[PDB]
Design a protein around this ligand. Structure first.
Ligand SMILES: Nc1ncnc2c1ncn2[C@@H]1O[C@H](COP(=O)(O)OP(=O)(O)O)[C@@H](O)[C@H]1O
Ligand SMILES: Nc1ncnc2c1ncn2[C@@H]1O[C@H](COP(=O)(O)OP(=O)(O)O)[C@@H](O)[C@H]1O
Ligand SMILES: Cc1cn([C@H]2C[C@H](N=[N+]=[N-])[C@@H](COP(=O)(O)O)O2)c(=O)[nH]c1=O
Ligand SMILES: Cc1cn([C@H]2C[C@H](N=[N+]=[N-])[C@@H](COP(=O)(O)O)O2)c(=O)[nH]c1=O
Ligand SMILES: [Mg+2]
Ligand SMILES: [Mg+2]
Ligand SMILES: [Mg+2]
Lengths: 209, 209
């Protein structure tokens, strides 16, 4: 009985990381075997290049960096497939969608080109998109000092997210992340239990193919 | 008056590296400004990952390694465009075609998926393909100890090369690499002078788009 592949995507400061952590804790407390993953995974060789780039410690050509972000997902696919096959549900803080939305927010990058490297990755059984008005996001802190942490660029990434959400091949669920941490969590946890029950019924899919 | 982008591709031991070196020397001796490049470019961070992989010092997931090879070309695009715009002809030992042919020789990799990461790279004005019968290749030494240096895999890569050569958007020229080093060189040098003269007439193209 395979585990589910659940991805959290969402706007800046909507709570992807907080909710991914809380979801894994709650699933495990409820007898599920669940584990957390995140992208970029900064621990690998490629992950360290990505981390240096995001911290502005290095500059990386845009196409190159896009492919490294994708390669960073592919290097974890053997682990991902192994875990799901063993019945372990995986909760993932950002995935290919952030990949496309962030590079797609740059000039002269078509969504089509941005999606290709990730075509064929393990397909999420559930993609949660945590929405929050910018006025509310602003109350959660200031912008970070990392790359891409500015409103103008975040807004172009958001437009790319909205295009990706028109894709009906994917089980997208909108989450109102403006509520309290606990309330948001309970909405996510219930959607997640539902997806875990049904994932055991159909084989793990392939993204964008 | 822009320089030309000339790529050498070809079967194992056909002489890509010898002929790329000799071509640059001859062009420069004939008053052209020409410089040599090669892929993979093993000097960069990504290049070092690629080098370790090819030497079998590390294993890398197939999709990941494919994207690193492509990223390794993209990180040199700013240099490539800068040089060509300054009138410098670039002679390149392997390019995106080796990228697709080598990954495409592996099980479950479509040519379409393999090509996508390289879509949009600087388009070569001339792609030389050095052909040689395997009996002749065998006389040029033994196989190397690096990855992919075995006849069965080389033969599947060759089939992918033949599919890529049906692409009429590209200026493919077959070279009979079974001749002497000097004879092969003179065939390549003449094709190259012709392409250099005409490249100054049309803008640098985009590959596979
Ligand atoms: N629902 C929420 N309400 C109020 N503050 C929140 C909420 N979710 C997260 N936060 C706070 O907002 C900040 C951003 O949360 P984080 O989970 O790191 O977001 P993301 O990973 O989406 O950038 C953290 O300080 C966190 O405690
Ligand atoms: N036309 C040729 N005839 C005979 N030997 C050749 C010829 N071209 C190259 N060689 C030799 O064959 C070997 C492979 O050449 P190399 O240029 O390194 O090939 P590639 O880069 O295609 O693998 C080298 O030892 C080289 O001297
Ligand atoms: C997974 C992924 C993230 N990103 C970005 C989104 C984030 N930048 N912002 N804002 C950045 C850091 O991610 P976190 O916000 O999850 O820490 O990486 C990409 O650009 N491509 C990708 O493939
Ligand atoms: C440029 C490139 C080369 N390769 C391979 C071809 C070669 N392996 N063999 N045989 C390897 C080393 O290249 P040289 O043969 O040019 O040294 O890299 C890829 O797999 N992908 C690529 O994108
Ligand atoms: Mg986060
Ligand atoms: Mg060589
Ligand atoms: Mg396509």
């Amino acid at each position: 009985r395979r585990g589910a592949l659940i991805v959290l995507e969402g706007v800046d400061r909507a709570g992807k990381s907080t909710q991914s952590r809380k979801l894994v804790e709650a699933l495990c407390a409820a007898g599920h075997r669940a584990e957390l993953l995140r992208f970029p995974e900064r621990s690998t060789e490629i992950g360290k290049l990505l981390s240096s780039y995001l911290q502005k410690k290095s500059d990386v050509e845009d196409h190159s960096v896009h492919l490294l972000f994708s390669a960073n997902r592919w290097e974890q696919v053997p682990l991902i497939k192994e875990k799901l096959s063993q019945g372990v549900t995986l909760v993932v803080d950002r995935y290919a969608f952030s990949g496309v939305a962030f590079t797609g927010a740059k000039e002269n990058f078509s969504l089509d080109w941005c999606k290709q490297p990730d075509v064929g990755l393990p397909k999420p059984d559930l993609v949660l998109f945590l929405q929050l008005q910018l006025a509310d996001a602003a109350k959660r802190g200031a912008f970070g000092h990392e790359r891409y942490e500015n409103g103008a660029f975040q807004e172009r990434a958001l437009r790319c997210f909205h295009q990706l959400m028109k894709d009906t091949t994917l089980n997208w669920k909108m989450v109102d992340a403006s509520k309290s941490i606990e309330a948001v969590h309970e909405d996510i946890r219930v959607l997640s239990e539902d997806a875990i029950a049904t994932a055991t019924e159909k084989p793990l899919g392939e993204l964008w193919k």
